[PDB]
Amino acid sequence: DDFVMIDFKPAFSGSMKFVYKEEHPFEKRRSEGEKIRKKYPDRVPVIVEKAPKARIGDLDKKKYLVPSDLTVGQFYFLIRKRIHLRAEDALFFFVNNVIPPTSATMGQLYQEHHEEDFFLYIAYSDESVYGL
């Protein structure tokens, strides 16, 4: 009866390339993701990498186990400190090529955007457009 109301996404959404995915075979990632979801069900596994062409410090660690109820805004706050951003430095996240809502929880993002390996992938940048 009723129509499913589909939300619009830009044409380039889902075009996120990650070095992590190139360096770790899919089935190893997927096996790990399944296991870590069972081991820590109140956390979500997240890969965080610099966006292509970003001009910003690199993280020493890419793999994060994040409480599901942590907001995107709180994750910004933590990441800024890990790379010693200055007060005037910008930081943007992208999930599937789109800046996620600052008020979303990481668990909400995970539900909507996790990949088939059971990981959520977040790119970060000094720029507000992914890969610019």
Author numbering: -14 to 117
What do the authors report?
Mammalian ATG8 proteins comprise two subfamilies, namely LC3s (LC3A, LC3B, and LC3C) and GABARAPs (GABARAP, GABARAP-L1, and GABARAP-L2). ATG8 proteins promote autophagosome formation, elongation, and closure, as well as fusion with lysosomes. The canonical LIR motif is a small Θ0-X1-X2-Γ3 motif, where Θ represents an aromatic residue (W/F/Y) and Γ an aliphatic residue (L/V/I) (whose side chains bind to hydrophobic pocket 1 (HP1) and HP2 of the LIR docking site (LDS), respectively) and X represents any amino acid (aa). In this study, we examined the molecular determinants that regulate selective binding of the centriolar satellite (CS) marker protein PCM1 (pericentriolar material 1) and the ULK1 complex to GABARAPs.
